[PDB]
Amino acid sequence: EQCSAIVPCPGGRCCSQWGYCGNTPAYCCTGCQSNCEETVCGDCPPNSGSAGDGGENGKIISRDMFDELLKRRNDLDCPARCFYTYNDFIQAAKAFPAFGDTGNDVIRKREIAAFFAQTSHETTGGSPGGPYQKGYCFKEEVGPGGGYCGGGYPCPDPGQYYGRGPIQLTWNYNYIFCGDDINQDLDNHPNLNSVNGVLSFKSAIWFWMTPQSPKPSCHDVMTNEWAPGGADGNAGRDPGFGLTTNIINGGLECGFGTDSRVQDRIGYFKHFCSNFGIDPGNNLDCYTQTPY
């Protein structure tokens, strides 16, 4: 839309020198008239290098491999440009030592590909049908709408539990449980997941690693540590990438045939599997799985 210093953007974006609303350096930096500097202006900071060669997990996903998977995330039209770094990812992963470090190298690669595929989908700046190089374009839900509070739990900030970070962590209960396990008060300070890159990655790896009955963890599914428990066989829940989509968002995406969101998750996964030189494995969709 149009805007000026005296008419800010209704939805809160930067008002450019020429009076249009947006979230890129052209709107937000030089000459910006209102609600400025909401994205980084200029070159990203140089790498901290605090992860070095990445350690144990860096044997599966090097610095270069991380930046090849997430090739276009620092395009000028990604609002999260410069936020997501290899050094923060490796520091976060060190807090969940089994992640990407369980099983033979084919399983470790496929776990990491699946994790980056699901988080790339949650934060996608790409177009339906691909290609699949612009994961991790965003770090906050674009139009935060409904209160995201399950009434069972404390809710000091009813409008503030919208999606943040690589898995777009949402709902008061997930901020409670995640914050508890990573020693952060995310219930009272939920913006930590969009202002601190290490905490942001920790929240996504936390979700990936944590069973929440009846759901197994995405980790145990992808590393061949889950077996269908009874109700599961006749709900159609078979081990593979599709079951991680069911765990993440199956109530809205699974059990009713071809769906564009599911296809986008699978598209990122196949692309990342090709980069890693591995096969995606079996049961890639959840089209005939009952949701949890």
Ligand SMILES: *[C@@H]1O[C@H](CO)[C@@H](O[C@@H]2O[C@H](CO)[C@@H](O)[C@H](O)[C@H]2NC(C)=O)[C@H](O)[C@H]1NC(C)=O
């Ligand atoms: C991002 O968050 C982390 C964790 O809250 C910060 O690093 C920790 O800071 C505490 C003190 O505040 C230290 O005792 C820890 O040793 C730090 N490292 C950890 C927990 O791994 C970090 O400083 C934050 N980054 C920014 C830029 O604010």
Ligand SMILES: [Cl-]
């Ligand atoms: Cl980086």
Ligand SMILES: [Cl-]
């Ligand atoms: Cl395998």
Ligand SMILES: [Cl-]
């Ligand atoms: Cl769900």
Ligand SMILES: [Mg+2]
């Ligand atoms: Mg979302």
Ligand SMILES: [Mg+2]
């Ligand atoms: Mg964003």
